[PDB]
Design an enzyme around this catalytic site. Structure first.
Site, PDB file in Angstrom:
ATOM      1  N   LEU A  43       0.841  -1.225   0.000  1.00 59.55           N
ATOM      2  CA  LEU A  43       0.000   0.000   0.000  1.00 59.55           C
ATOM      3  C   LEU A  43       0.857   1.249   0.000  1.00 59.55           C
ATOM      4  O   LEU A  43       1.867   1.316   0.703  1.00 59.55           O
ATOM      5  CB  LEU A  43      -0.955  -0.017   1.192  1.00 59.55           C
ATOM      6  CG  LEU A  43      -1.839   1.219   1.378  1.00 59.55           C
ATOM      7  CD1 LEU A  43      -3.215   0.798   1.882  1.00 59.55           C
ATOM      8  CD2 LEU A  43      -1.199   2.220   2.342  1.00 59.55           C
ATOM      9  N   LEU A  44       0.433   2.200  -0.844  1.00 61.14           N
ATOM     10  CA  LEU A  44       0.979   3.579  -0.868  1.00 61.14           C
ATOM     11  C   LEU A  44      -0.087   4.502  -0.304  1.00 61.14           C
ATOM     12  O   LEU A  44      -1.291   4.356  -0.642  1.00 61.14           O
ATOM     13  CB  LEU A  44       1.288   3.933  -2.313  1.00 61.14           C
ATOM     14  CG  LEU A  44       2.511   4.773  -2.541  1.00 61.14           C
ATOM     15  CD1 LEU A  44       3.734   3.990  -2.117  1.00 61.14           C
ATOM     16  CD2 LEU A  44       2.579   5.219  -4.016  1.00 61.14           C
ATOM     17  N   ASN A  45       0.331   5.488   0.463  1.00 59.36           N
ATOM     18  CA  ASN A  45      -0.594   6.602   0.803  1.00 59.36           C
ATOM     19  C   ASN A  45       0.194   7.913   0.688  1.00 59.36           C
ATOM     20  O   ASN A  45       1.119   7.986  -0.163  1.00 59.36           O
ATOM     21  CB  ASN A  45      -1.482   6.372   2.014  1.00 59.36           C
ATOM     22  CG  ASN A  45      -0.810   6.205   3.367  1.00 59.36           C
ATOM     23  OD1 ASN A  45      -0.024   5.291   3.540  1.00 59.36           O
ATOM     24  ND2 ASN A  45      -1.093   7.115   4.296  1.00 59.36           N
ATOM     25  N   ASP A  46      -0.121   8.868   1.541  1.00 61.24           N
ATOM     26  CA  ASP A  46       0.291  10.289   1.471  1.00 61.24           C
ATOM     27  C   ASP A  46       1.668  10.498   0.856  1.00 61.24           C
ATOM     28  O   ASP A  46       2.671  10.064   1.356  1.00 61.24           O
ATOM     29  CB  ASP A  46       0.412  10.891   2.873  1.00 61.24           C
ATOM     30  CG  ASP A  46      -0.742  10.617   3.830  1.00 61.24           C
ATOM     31  OD1 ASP A  46      -1.739   9.951   3.438  1.00 61.24           O
ATOM     32  OD2 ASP A  46      -0.699  11.239   4.901  1.00 61.24           O
ATOM     33  N   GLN A  62       4.410   7.563   1.993  1.00 63.58           N
ATOM     34  CA  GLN A  62       3.955   6.622   3.041  1.00 63.58           C
ATOM     35  C   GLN A  62       3.767   5.240   2.379  1.00 63.58           C
ATOM     36  O   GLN A  62       3.040   5.145   1.353  1.00 63.58           O
ATOM     37  CB  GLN A  62       2.623   7.080   3.642  1.00 63.58           C
ATOM     38  CG  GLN A  62       2.678   8.318   4.537  1.00 63.58           C
ATOM     39  CD  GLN A  62       3.337   7.972   5.842  1.00 63.58           C
ATOM     40  OE1 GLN A  62       2.698   7.315   6.678  1.00 63.58           O
ATOM     41  NE2 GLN A  62       4.626   8.341   5.991  1.00 63.58           N
ATOM     42  N   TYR A 105       5.224   8.503  10.156  1.00 65.94           N
ATOM     43  CA  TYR A 105       4.036   9.132   9.549  1.00 65.94           C
ATOM     44  C   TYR A 105       4.485  10.287   8.647  1.00 65.94           C
ATOM     45  O   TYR A 105       5.714  10.554   8.451  1.00 65.94           O
ATOM     46  CB  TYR A 105       3.059   9.550  10.633  1.00 65.94           C
ATOM     47  CG  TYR A 105       2.037   8.521  11.066  1.00 65.94           C
ATOM     48  CD1 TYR A 105       2.126   7.181  10.742  1.00 65.94           C
ATOM     49  CD2 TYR A 105       0.968   8.941  11.847  1.00 65.94           C
ATOM     50  CE1 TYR A 105       1.139   6.282  11.121  1.00 65.94           C
ATOM     51  CE2 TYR A 105      -0.015   8.063  12.239  1.00 65.94           C
ATOM     52  CZ  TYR A 105       0.075   6.742  11.878  1.00 65.94           C
ATOM     53  OH  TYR A 105      -0.966   5.996  12.317  1.00 65.94           O
ATOM     54  N   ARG A 165       0.036  15.978  14.045  1.00 65.26           N
ATOM     55  CA  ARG A 165       0.902  15.300  13.056  1.00 65.26           C
ATOM     56  C   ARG A 165       0.993  16.029  11.718  1.00 65.26           C
ATOM     57  O   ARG A 165       0.208  16.969  11.492  1.00 65.26           O
ATOM     58  CB  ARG A 165       0.416  13.860  12.861  1.00 65.26           C
ATOM     59  CG  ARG A 165      -1.033  13.664  12.404  1.00 65.26           C
ATOM     60  CD  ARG A 165      -1.292  12.205  12.112  1.00 65.26           C
ATOM     61  NE  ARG A 165      -2.673  11.963  11.721  1.00 65.26           N
ATOM     62  CZ  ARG A 165      -3.674  11.762  12.569  1.00 65.26           C
ATOM     63  NH1 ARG A 165      -3.401  11.612  13.852  1.00 65.26           N
ATOM     64  NH2 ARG A 165      -4.900  11.547  12.116  1.00 65.26           N
ATOM     65  N   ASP A 166       1.873  15.529  10.853  1.00 69.78           N
ATOM     66  CA  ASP A 166       1.965  15.918   9.420  1.00 69.78           C
ATOM     67  C   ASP A 166       2.634  17.283   9.275  1.00 69.78           C
ATOM     68  O   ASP A 166       2.081  18.200   8.652  1.00 69.78           O
ATOM     69  CB  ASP A 166       0.605  15.852   8.742  1.00 69.78           C
ATOM     70  CG  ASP A 166      -0.122  14.534   8.852  1.00 69.78           C
ATOM     71  OD1 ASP A 166       0.535  13.513   9.159  1.00 69.78           O
ATOM     72  OD2 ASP A 166      -1.378  14.544   8.622  1.00 69.78           O
ATOM     73  N   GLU A 221      -5.710  16.738   8.671  1.00 72.61           N
ATOM     74  CA  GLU A 221      -4.564  15.969   8.205  1.00 72.61           C
ATOM     75  C   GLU A 221      -3.869  16.726   7.069  1.00 72.61           C
ATOM     76  O   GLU A 221      -4.516  17.495   6.304  1.00 72.61           O
ATOM     77  CB  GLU A 221      -5.046  14.575   7.771  1.00 72.61           C
ATOM     78  CG  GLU A 221      -5.518  13.728   8.970  1.00 72.61           C
ATOM     79  CD  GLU A 221      -5.841  12.288   8.582  1.00 72.61           C
ATOM     80  OE1 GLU A 221      -6.402  12.087   7.459  1.00 72.61           O
ATOM     81  OE2 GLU A 221      -5.533  11.363   9.383  1.00 72.61           O
TER      82      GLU A 221
HETATM   83  O1  LIG Z   1       0.150   6.984   6.940  1.00 69.53           O
HETATM   84  C1  LIG Z   1      -0.093   7.929   7.999  1.00 69.53           C
HETATM   85  C2  LIG Z   1      -0.592   9.295   7.509  1.00 69.53           C
HETATM   86  O2  LIG Z   1      -1.850   9.230   6.871  1.00 69.53           O
HETATM   87  C3  LIG Z   1      -2.786  10.200   7.368  1.00 69.53           C
HETATM   88  O3  LIG Z   1      -3.662   9.510   8.322  1.00 69.53           O
HETATM   89  C4  LIG Z   1      -3.560  10.830   6.179  1.00 69.53           C
HETATM   90  O4  LIG Z   1      -3.884   9.892   5.090  1.00 69.53           O
HETATM   91  C5  LIG Z   1      -1.875  11.239   8.047  1.00 69.53           C
HETATM   92  O5  LIG Z   1      -2.456  12.190   8.964  1.00 69.53           O
HETATM   93  C6  LIG Z   1      -0.760  10.298   8.632  1.00 69.53           C
HETATM   94  O6  LIG Z   1       0.501  10.930   8.725  1.00 69.53           O
END
Ligand SMILES: OC[C@H]1O[C@](O)(CO)[C@@H](O)[C@@H]1O
Ligand SMILES: OC[C@H]1O[C@](O)(CO)[C@@H](O)[C@@H]1O
Lengths: 488, 488
Positions: A43-46, A62, A105, A165-166, A221
């Protein structure tokens, strides 16, 4: 169905054969993207650390490499000369220390004295699985090698909950600032918290940015401040945003808000727009990151995928992808988003189009279709279609007296998060011409509307043989169709 | 220093954290190539399955992903539209069955009825670690998914030793043929063994190809037959070749031999050249694979790396890379090798050159330098140089009365297989002009001489700050210098 224990098992407790098998399964999926960033496995995210450093563009991601789920997160690293041709530089930050024991994160990148500082949230979980978020400043050198400190730059203040966070780290008016997504412990309201430093060593909390009296959901976020044509623009994800403020149909929205002015010392924002607006009018964009590049442009890139959602490719053990990079512009008090000029270099086999009802009987899986459609018309454009137009991605258009675009993915393939609807609608000006620039790549579609006034981005899972492009009725239009070369 | 037991440990017995760390270490090496195929982790060797299938070019690779050593081998898979922009499709064939329990060794690819057949040697080791080579025909579909049979296509005949491998499967005059590298059990001589089939089910041994009365070493690895401008051309690796037949300086040579005619039914070759010649006059080319593409060109690509050798990057836990693809031509009874026309698309920042002694004070790590040097001259061109020209890759040229090119890598950086010499020499025609087209990429240099009449390919490990390009003396020449964009 994946338990907490399975999601948080350390990467060293997985075997390498499993990982190699997952890389093969992801890369060879018939739904894989081949000119957009996608996971090598899992999985890829942010998007994270989007930057220019040491002669090239950098982008981090991520990552959970072992399946289609939000398992314990790491950063991976890509670089490019042109924001299109990305090459993989491997894992960058692992959840391998006390500060980040339950995830590295999201975060940002800022050049400093010949190094690239990578500021990210350490997702610590203590003896009792209590979350303690730490903000950490790691450092990357000119060989793309990263060192991480033993101590946090910012410890969580008493007035925020576990959601804090972030970080976006940047330099502005000779000082350093950090913007963080924050939930107020007492109100459970979402905020952007501002920190400032003269030296990157001592941090002062300036407090929540004043975005008016209406709540921005329960959590923000991925906050970003970028300067676009000299306007301060916020891009952020207010989970639980009241739709009274702005309509949105996705589970959690990705908004932007143009300011006339921002004062980070006093935590003041002077809005240009009365209300924030959706960055993307489609089905799947989240966690957009943006930065101010040294060429004088602001660039953004989006996670195509939503938290708390599922996809048809989950059974193939991988998930999600990124958007293409968008160059930002403010025009007529709205944010416009444009493909970067380098993406034209992928085009081949140009076809000129003038009024043809069937554009292609079989267009392939990777193309760009750019159309200019006359005012006064109504009809449907089918993409990724079967012959009888009963299974397709539909762009239902009206450029006449009730002008609008409706994108309908219900018949395109298996259902995709259908609790959040199978249509998305974009109002248009009555009796006006319509520009579309549509990019298809595997299971991704990006529709740039009226030269980037709106963008609709979505996943869709069409049968491999459904490649027709056709209008349902005779339509007056000009355009071009190009194939798009594989690069990833 | 890696024992047999460590090299043959199954991939499932390595942990995934180790593999992710190795991917980062390989990708972020300051000696990594960024416009040539390189390992994602560990060691790359012989190109395999080089083909055109399902709308694109395919290339597979011998891989040991866990370190810089010949551990138990698998195939990995890449594809491209243009023989330049490759994308990774992950592992293809694992050493996971009885037939290939100690390696999925090298092989070829042939399209058949909408599938791609992948014919490879299974390196079986029995209860006593006795090697039994099997020839296996696996099958890949249009989604790049591979199935492997339970039984070998070709069992080893009694008259070959354990060395019997590297099948080239192709169709010619309405029949199927397989060429295999073979060591005769009685003489311990190297041969190309020919098999034929009408149906791909039953195989008939036609016997050793008759290459004359002189032995071709003790073993022939990686044999290939390709048709170039209608001539049959052998490209092969005769280990232990007597230098009486042809001079070579590398530990094992990669030769080619142009025929006037070949008759695979009768195992006859009619040589055009009296003797085979070195394919590459440089330091590191081996295991070249070639194929006849549907555009009517023959294409080759080489492993840059030699068996039984070591490199300075071994301590970084990865090894080797590929050459760029070479389009083949027969001219004046010799094999010419040309960059593919698509590699020009990587060029940027063109500089025109006319007689300048210093071409660049600092050229970067990825460039193409193309020079036309007048007859009647002698001097040295320094690449990847320090300021004082004492540390560099040297091209010592004479286009006057004792014309020749000597490539000297002794001062370029740490020693590279110095038992096989630090210079390579290519004779030139006296009092003639000289063309050079030189590609530098990280720790790889490829020098195309006189429009591909000769090619010299080598590894070299220069300090990152050694990027000067200069002649030692005033030299009459014209040329161009381009930067070359990263794509991998
Ligand atoms: O993968 C973790 C990250 O993803 C989030 O929940 C948003 O998609 C962020 O706030 C967190 O840093
Ligand atoms: O990796 C195994 C392969 O390598 C070679 O020894 C040549 O470099 C081949 O004969 C064998 O198939």
């Amino acid at each position: 169905e994946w338990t907490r224990e399975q999601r948080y098992r350390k990467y060293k407790d997985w075997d390498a054969q499993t990982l190699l098998d997952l890389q093969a399964q992801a890369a060879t999926s018939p739904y894989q993207m081949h000119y957009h960033i996608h996971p090598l496995s899992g999985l890829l995210n942010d998007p994270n650390g989007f930057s220019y450093y040491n002669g090239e563009y950098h982008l981090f991601c991520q990552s959970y490499p072992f399946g289609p789920v939000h398992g314990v997160k790491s950063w991976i690293h890509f670089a490019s000369p042109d924001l299109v041709h990305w090459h993989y530089l491997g894992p960058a930050i692992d959840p391998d220390s006390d500060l980040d024991n339950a995830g590295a994160y999201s975060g940002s990148a800022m050049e400093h004295n010949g190094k690239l500082l990578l500021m990210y949230t350490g997702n610590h979980r203590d003896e009792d699985w209590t979350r303690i978020p730490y903000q950490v400043i790691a450092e990357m050198d000119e060989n793309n090698h990263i060192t991480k400190p033993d101590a946090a730059a910012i410890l969580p203040p008493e007035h925020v909950s576990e959601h804090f966070r972030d970080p976006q780290l940047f330099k502005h008016d000779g000082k350093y600032y950090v913007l963080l997504g924050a939930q107020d412990a007492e109100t459970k309201s979402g905020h952007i918290d501002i920190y400032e430093s003269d030296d990157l060593k001592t941090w002062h909390e300036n407090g929540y940015l004043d975005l008016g009296k209406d709540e921005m959901g329960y959590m923000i976020e991925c906050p970003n401040l970028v300067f676009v044509n000299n306007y301060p623009v916020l891009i952020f994800c207010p989970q639980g945003l009241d739709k009274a403020i702005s309509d949105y149909q996705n589970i959690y929205p990705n908004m932007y808000w143009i300011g006339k002015d921002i004062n980070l010392n006093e935590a003041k924002f002077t809005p240009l727009q009365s209300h924030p607006a959706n960055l993307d009018d489609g089905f799947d964009v989240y966690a957009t990151q943006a930065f101010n590049a040294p060429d004088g442009n602001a660039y953004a890139i989006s996670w195509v995928g939503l938290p708390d959602c599922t996809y048809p490719t989950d059974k193939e053990n991988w998930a999600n992808c990124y958007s293409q990079v968008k160059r930002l512009e403010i025009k007529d008090g709205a944010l416009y988003q444009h493909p970067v000029d380098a993406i034209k270099n992928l085009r081949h086999n140009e076809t000129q189009l003038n009024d043809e009802k069937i554009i292609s009987q079989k267009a392939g899986k990777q193309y760009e279709l750019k159309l200019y459609l006359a005012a006064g018309q109504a009809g449907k454009l089918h993409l990724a279609s079967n012959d009888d137009l009963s299974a397709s991605l539909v762009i239902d258009f009206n450029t006449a007296q009730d002008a609008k675009l409706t994108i309908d993915r219900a018949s395109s393939g298996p259902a995709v998060n259908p609790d959040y609807g199978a249509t998305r609608t974009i109002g248009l000006n009555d009796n006006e011409d319509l520009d579309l620039d549509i990019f298809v790549d595997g299971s991704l579609c990006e529709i740039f509307i009226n030269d980037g006034r709106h963008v609709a981005t979505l996943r869709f899972f069409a049968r491999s043989s459904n490649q027709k492009i056709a209008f349902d009725k005779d339509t007056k239009y000009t355009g071009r169709l190009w194939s798009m070369n594989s690069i990833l």
